[PDB]
Swiss-Prot record, chain A:
The lineage of its organism: Bacteria, Bacillati, Bacillota, Bacilli, Lactobacillales. It comes from Levilactobacillus brevis (strain ATCC 367 / BCRC 12310 / CIP 105137 / JCM 1170 / LMG 11437 / NCIMB 947 / NCTC 947) (Lactobacillus brevis). This is Energy-coupling factor transporter transmembrane protein EcfT. It is a multi-pass membrane protein. GO terms for cellular component: plasma membrane. The chain crosses the membrane at residues 32-52, 71-91, 107-127, 152-172, 246-266. The gene is ecfT. Transmembrane (T) component of an energy-coupling factor (ECF) ABC-transporter complex. Unlike classic ABC transporters this ECF transporter provides the energy necessary to transport a number of different substrates.
From Swiss-Prot, chain B:
It comes from Levilactobacillus brevis (strain ATCC 367 / BCRC 12310 / CIP 105137 / JCM 1170 / LMG 11437 / NCIMB 947 / NCTC 947) (Lactobacillus brevis). InterPro entries: AAA+_ATPase, ABC_transporter-like_ATP-bd, ABC_transporter-like_CS, ABC_transpr_CbiO/EcfA_su, ECF_ABC_transporter_ATP-bd, EcfA_1, P-loop_NTPase. This is Energy-coupling factor transporter ATP-binding protein EcfA1. One of its GO terms (cellular component) is ATP-binding cassette (ABC) transporter complex. It is an enzyme of class 7 (translocase). Its EC number is 7.-.-.-. ATP-binding (A) component of a common energy-coupling factor (ECF) ABC-transporter complex. Unlike classic ABC transporters this ECF transporter provides the energy necessary to transport a number of different substrates.
From Swiss-Prot, chain D:
The gene is ecfA2. Forms a stable energy-coupling factor (ECF) transporter complex composed of 2 membrane-embedded substrate-binding proteins (S component), 2 ATP-binding proteins (A component) and 2 transmembrane proteins (T component). It is found in: Cell membrane. SMART domains: AAA. It comes from the Bacteria. ATP-binding (A) component of a common energy-coupling factor (ECF) ABC-transporter complex. Unlike classic ABC transporters this ECF transporter provides the energy necessary to transport a number of different substrates. The keyword Transport applies. Its EC number is 7.-.-.-. This is Energy-coupling factor transporter ATP-binding protein EcfA2. Keywords: ATP-binding, Cell membrane, Membrane, Nucleotide-binding, Translocase, Transport. It is a peripheral membrane protein. It comes from Levilactobacillus brevis (strain ATCC 367 / BCRC 12310 / CIP 105137 / JCM 1170 / LMG 11437 / NCIMB 947 / NCTC 947) (Lactobacillus brevis). GO terms for molecular function: ATP binding; ATP hydrolysis activity; ATPase-coupled transmembrane transporter activity.
């Protein structure tokens, strides 16, 4: 009962947790371009309003949201310090020596960079911590179907993704089994120097590969026995239901879109 | 009854230069029966099982199921009436939920969603699996996966149930439960079931033993007549039941019991009447 | 461009598709067996891509690479931009072109690896991060170049060893057949 | 060479217990059906540590505050064979794979290759197999090679889990006979965890029943298997001979003791019938 879905996910009831994955996916895709368009202060103000409204409507702890920030920090500093060190001049310089310049341009532009970075990270982490991992594959399959006209097999890709998103846990478990069964023979996993670290991993790659291939062959035979002739000649069982919550969310986003369009600097 | 499965002159090699695995397999199958193909490891019987469903391409001979003779053009038609459960119970799932697995068969054959849910629900409730419908697949008991696969194959509604080895990976209780479930299914829907086996119990319930050794029919009899070959039954591919244990043990200790096969009740009554008289 | 792939082709054997899926899963799980630090990171995902390319060929390699990149990015976290997918497909295509259906050899592997590193891992990625984070370009570029030029030598030897191990040959025995 | 005195670890509390296992013995652990709980065996070995006192195994004594540093010598004294030991064969040749253990702990390479020959001979194989690659070997031959490889550490206490899983009756018989011969000749104390009751009935000296991680009995099989109702509580059972003996007794015959294996019942019935004549 203590389900452990792959990766990270919160089972918290909310409104955002109830949207169709399709709408969330498309909104996430369009968010980058919408951010790109904004240039002036009022633009960023309206964008901040939209994002803060969105995140606050999810009941997620503010602590988790900062976790996704951590594996990007060095770039954040690097960028801000460089743009406050070798930067365009113009204004009241606080301290100048050699290339070092500290003007009002630094304040305004650095504030812009920081806010934009924060928004991008926020809307990136929300998508992950707003949707069941499994449904993402089905949503992508549904939103990729129109590609059939240009003759790129998509149903086969959907089948492959469905296969992989089930295999992942089993391989991760076999990895632990191999780890333990070989630590029985004294192979110190993780100790020693870097050369020793990478030298002792071959008896964690070879057996995993062999076991994976055996599983693949047996699964292929079993599936063929059922009658899986080809693709695109097959009905669908797990379907999606587009409710009006999606319509209202899309309408609100488009209202914000037109607002940013008319209020930005042309 | 008209022989559902007709097989004759079957010789095949899954590797060109390997020793003859199967050689001129000749046997027949009626309807509503329970066969048993038992033989020591290395003789080759899984090859026979795989060939019976038209999986491996063979050359010599011809197999016929439900009138249609097997050709490399009608295999898809044949496979509709043939279903089987494979050896390892962890390498037979296709979906991310039990419901998806049991649905897979129905989805494969072009059908409508609106009609799907009642059938999958009935199938799941026909094997006592309903309460685990929504959970992930890598959480069930070892035998529960076999039960789910059985539910799916029941849902597809076939006539022949090739019960390839499906009782080695499990524990005693799971084996007993699976045997009971297949008993119930056979009794209800009149399904002919073949079985590749090493355990005594499944062979005991069957009605015909078809010992195969070195790709050859060496014997064929009724369970009763074949559970009498002393120690060599161990080499045959089975384990002697407890009755045979006591049977053989008594002989060495200087007492001669009867000859024919007996169950628990028969030996019980024989010993009780023999001793209580004196 | 010695060979032209199949823009369309007859449907694959089930074995091939299931192998593709399992290798996708293997690539997805490798990310958690990494060795490195927050600043210096050394992953082992580039191994599987070359294997996929060599075994199956350009078109399927490209499609699988795109799908795996997109799903993994949306699944773990961080931004989602088309440039990363473009880089992945380019890398897979280079691998397939320089290695598919040719005998495994030293010079081929070294030449392929150096080209992929220099082109995709520095230039395209640096440009994408410049466009999508407005970080200065001509100050950042050398820093990543240092890392790539110090790490690629390991990649070449690892790829060679993977391609010359027995288990790969044994699998190919039952795969090509 | 195992002793305990109400000091084991106490997740729901596992009560502290006391037990002792003689040397060159046979401890069979018929555990909880739903899970064999290799973790419970790991309560003192590998990662998980014990608490609430001291444990003593041969020379090494596990104090309550002993950290992983002292666990290294334990690894070179207790051998365990995981279920399906065929998943850990990675090395070009059988000889090299067999010697991976001793070479890892640190031996002369030529010496390890020398021990490879004797240890291969022990499991009853041919030296020609030495050159072949493991992946091209038969089914049970891989298991036997892995068993030899783990056995090559010349330890004194062996941990075997579900050894006869996925075999035919002949294979199980041969494997258990090999283990019995090693027990009686080379003098190792083997701890067994398994489901089949016949192996426990015949090849055993002391048994143990564990339900959800709680040792609720100990001693010889003779005493443990004489409380039928007690074992049915924990989804357990008794040897077929026990069923037959109970059926016969309920029919109106008496025996001094419960016959565990079919041989004991056969001897009792033979002598009793001979007395009647």
């Amino acid at each position: 009962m203590s389900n452990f879905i792959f990766g990270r996910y919160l089972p918290l009831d909310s409104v955002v947790h109830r949207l169709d994955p399709r709408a969330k996916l498309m909104l996430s895709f369009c968010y980058i371009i919408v951010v790109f368009l904004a240039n002036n202060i009022w633009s960023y103000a309206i964008l901040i309003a939209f994002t803060v409204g969105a995140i606050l409507s999810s009941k997620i702890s503010l602590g988790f949201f900062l976790k996704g920030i951590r594996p990007l920090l060095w770039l954040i500093v690097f960028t801000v310090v460089l743009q406050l060190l070798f930067s365009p001049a113009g204004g009241h310089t606080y301290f100048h020596w050699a290339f070092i310049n500290v003007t009002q341009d630094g304040l305004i532009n650095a504030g812009y960079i920081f806010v934009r970075f924060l928004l991008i990270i926020m809307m990136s982490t929300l998508l992950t911590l707003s949707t069941q991992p499994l449904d993402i594959a089905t949503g992508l399959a549904s939103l990729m179907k129109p590609l059939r006209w240009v003759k790129v097999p998509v149903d086969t890709l959907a089948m492959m993704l469905s296969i992989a998103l089930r295999f992942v846990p089993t391989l991760m478990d076999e990895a632990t089994k191999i780890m333990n069964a070989q630590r029985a023979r004294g192979v110190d996993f993780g100790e020693g120097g870097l050369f020793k670290q990478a030298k002792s991993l071959i008896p964690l790659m070879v057996p995993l590969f062999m076991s994976a291939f055996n599983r693949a062959e047996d699964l292929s035979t079993a599936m063929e026995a059922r009658g899986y002739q080809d693709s695109e000649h097959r009905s669908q069982y797990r379907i999606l239901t587009w409710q009006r919550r999606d319509t209202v969310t899309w309408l609100l986003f488009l209202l914000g879109f037109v607002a940013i369009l008319i209020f930005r600097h042309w | 009854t008209e022989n559902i499965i007709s097989v004759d002159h079957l010789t095949y090699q899954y590797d060109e230069n390997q020793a003859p695995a199967l050689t001129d397999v000749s046997f027949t199958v009626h309807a509503g029966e329970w066969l048993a193909i038992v033989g020591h490891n290395g003789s080759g019987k899984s090859t026979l099982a795989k060939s019976l469903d038209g999986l491996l391409p063979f050359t010599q001979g011809s197999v016929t199921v439900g009138g249609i003779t097997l050709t490399p053009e009608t295999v898809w038609q044949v496979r509709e009436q043939i279903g089987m459960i494979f050896q390892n119970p962890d390498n037979q799932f296709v979906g991310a939920t039990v419901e998806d697995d049991v649905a897979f068969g129905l989805e494969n054959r072009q059908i409508s969603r609106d009609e799907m849910v009642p059938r999958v629900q009935a199938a799941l409730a026909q094997v006592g699996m309903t309460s685990f419908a929504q959970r992930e697949p890598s959480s069930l008991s070892g035998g529960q996966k076999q039960r789910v696969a059985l539910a799916g194959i029941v849902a597809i509604a076939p006539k022949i149930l090739i019960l390839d080895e499906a009782t080695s990976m499990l524990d005693p209780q799971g084996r007993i439960e699976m045997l009971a479930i297949v008993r119930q299914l056979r009794q209800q829907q009149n399904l002919t079931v073949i079985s590749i086996t090493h355990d005594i119990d499944e062979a005991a319930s069957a009605d015909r033993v078809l010992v195969i050794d070195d790709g050859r029919l060496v014997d064929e009899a009724v369970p009763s007549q074949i559970f009498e070959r002393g120690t060599q039954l161990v080499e045959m591919g089975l384990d002697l039941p407890f009755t045979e244990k006591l049977k053989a043990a008594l002989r060495q200790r200087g007492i001669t019991p009867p000859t024919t096969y007996q169950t628990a009740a028969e030996m019980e009554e024989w010993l009780w009447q023999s001793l209580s008289n004196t | 461009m010695k060979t032209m792939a199949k823009t369309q082709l007859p449907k694959l054997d089930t074995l091939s598709m299931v192998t593709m899926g399992v290798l996708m899963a293997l690539q997805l799980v490798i990310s958690r067996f990494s060795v490195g630090n927050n600043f210096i990171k050394v992953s082992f995902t580039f191994l599987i891509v070359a294997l996929i390319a060599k075994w199956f060929g350009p078109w399927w390699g490209m499609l699988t690479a795109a799908v795996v990149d997109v799903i993994g990015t949306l699944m773990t976290g961080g931004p989602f931009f088309i440039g990363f997918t473009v880089s992945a497909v380019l890398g897979s295509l280079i691998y397939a072109v320089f290695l598919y259906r040719q005998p495994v050899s030293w010079w081929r592997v070294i030449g392929a690896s150096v080209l992929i590193a220099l082109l995709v891992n520095t230039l395209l990625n640096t440009l994408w991060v410049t466009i999508m984070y407005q970080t200065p370009f001509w100050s950042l570029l050398p820093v990543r170049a240092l890392k790539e030029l110090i790490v690629t030598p390991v990649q070449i030897v690892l790829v060679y060893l993977l391609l010359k191990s027995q288990v790969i040959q044994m699998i190919q025995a039952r795969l090509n057949k | 060479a195992i002793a305990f005195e109400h000091v084991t670890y106490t997740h729901t509390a596992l009560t502290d217990v006391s037990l002792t296992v003689p040397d060159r013995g046979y401890l069979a652990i018929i555990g909880h059906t739903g899970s064999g709980k290799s973790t419970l065996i790991q309560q003192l070995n590998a990662l998980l540590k014990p608490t609430s006192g001291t444990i003593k195994i041969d020379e090494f004594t596990i104090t309550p505050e002993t950290t992983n540093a002292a666990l290294k010598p334990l690894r070179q004294h207790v051998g365990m064979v995981f279920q399906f030991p065929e998943n850990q064969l990675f090395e070009e040749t059988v000889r090299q794979d067999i010697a991976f253990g001793p070479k890892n702990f640190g031996m002369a390479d030529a010496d390890a290759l020398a021990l490879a020959d004797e240890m291969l001979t022990t499991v009853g194989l041919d030296q020609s197999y030495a050159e072949r690659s493991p992946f091209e070997l038969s089914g049970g031959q891989m298991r036997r090679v892995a068993i030899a490889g783990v056995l090559a550490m010349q330890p004194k206490v062996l941990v075997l889990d579900e050894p006869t899983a996925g075999l035919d009756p002949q294979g199980r018989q041969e494997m258990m006979r090999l283990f019995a011969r090693l027990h009686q000749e080379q003098g190792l104390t083997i701890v067994l965890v398994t489901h089949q009751m016949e192996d426990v009935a015949q090849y055993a000296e002391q048994v143990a029943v564990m339900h959800e991680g709680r040792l609720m009995k100990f001693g010889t099989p003779a005493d443990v298997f004489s409380n039928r109702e007690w074992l049915q509580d924990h989804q357990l059972d008794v040897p077929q001979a026990a069923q037959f003996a109970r059926r016969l007794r309920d029919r109106g015959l008496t025996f001094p003791k419960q016959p565990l294996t079919a041989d004991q019942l056969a001897d009792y019935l033979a002598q009793q019938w001979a007395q009647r004549g």
